[PDB]
Amino acid sequence: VNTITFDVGNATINKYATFMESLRNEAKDPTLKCYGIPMLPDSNLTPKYVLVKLQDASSKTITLMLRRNNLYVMGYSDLYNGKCRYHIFNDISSTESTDVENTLCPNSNSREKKAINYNSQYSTLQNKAGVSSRSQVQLGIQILNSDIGKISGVSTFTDKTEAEFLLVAIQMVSEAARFKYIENQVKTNFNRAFNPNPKVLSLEENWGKIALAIHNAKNGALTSPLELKNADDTKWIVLRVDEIKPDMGLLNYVSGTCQTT
Ligand SMILES: Nc1ncnc2[nH]cnc12
């Protein structure tokens, strides 16, 4: 399994772009694509995981573990009290949990369990963060940096603190890798906090449906309209691959052949 490092504490737009490039290039299947857009592999291709190490301004780190097949964050690790501490979501199976344990913290003689005692759905994370919408949880480079320092090497912390960190890291890492539009929202706002707009949220919520729509399209025409949101919360009725492709970083895995370019 590869570990890709992103230096949050000394970040620049260019360094974030390179991070996104490296993460997409590691995660993607070596060959699968539809309409020129790289696709994630089946669940059997090895390595099955990618690690993402986030470094703050004091060189504290948190390492996220991502599933390659769907880019979900499965859990994360930090160094505390001389040990590797692994924090796994509670909706990960026993088999995958064993992988997470041993991939984040291969030294079984110096590690510690500190579970994430809730599941990894956005509805749950929002509940734990106290917000009715993750539009209300700002994203940003300084926020991500600050959040790392509230958790890494910290014995005990609240579920709210953790969920806020997870919302920010999931969106700035996995969702940005999935969607060039979201990468670009981070880059346009690189120097400030920002609230994810309706188009960010819509893309996040519809990634699986978008992959299927692109995979199924014939001669660039979607088989049925795909309704998303524009950034002003108006409806975006997508009819062709041409309209959605610029926003895409990675397609979710979809079995079967497609129009490849
Ligand atoms: N834990 C997670 N990781 C990646 N994408 C997600 N979408 C919702 N929860 C997520």
UniProtKB/Swiss-Prot annotation:
SUPFAM superfamilies to which the protein is assigned, alphabetical: Ribosome inactivating proteins (RIP) (SSF56371)
A single GO BP: negative regulation of translation
EC number: 3.2.2.22
Residue pairs linked by disulfide bridges in the UniProt entry: 34-258, 84-105
Parts forming coiled coils: none
Keywords, ordered alphabetically: Disulfide bond, Glycoprotein, Hydrolase, Plant defense, Protein synthesis inhibitor, Toxin
Keyword set includes Hydrolase: yes
UniProt-listed PANTHER family: PTHR33453, RIBOSOME-INACTIVATING PROTEIN (PTHR33453:SF34)
Note: 2 forms exist, PD-L3 and PD-L4, that differ in their post-translational modifications. PD-L4 is not glycosylated.
Free-text function comment from the UniProt entry: Inhibits protein synthesis. Does not cleave supercoiled pBR322 dsDNA.
Name of the protein in its database record: Ribosome-inactivating protein PD-L3/PD-L4
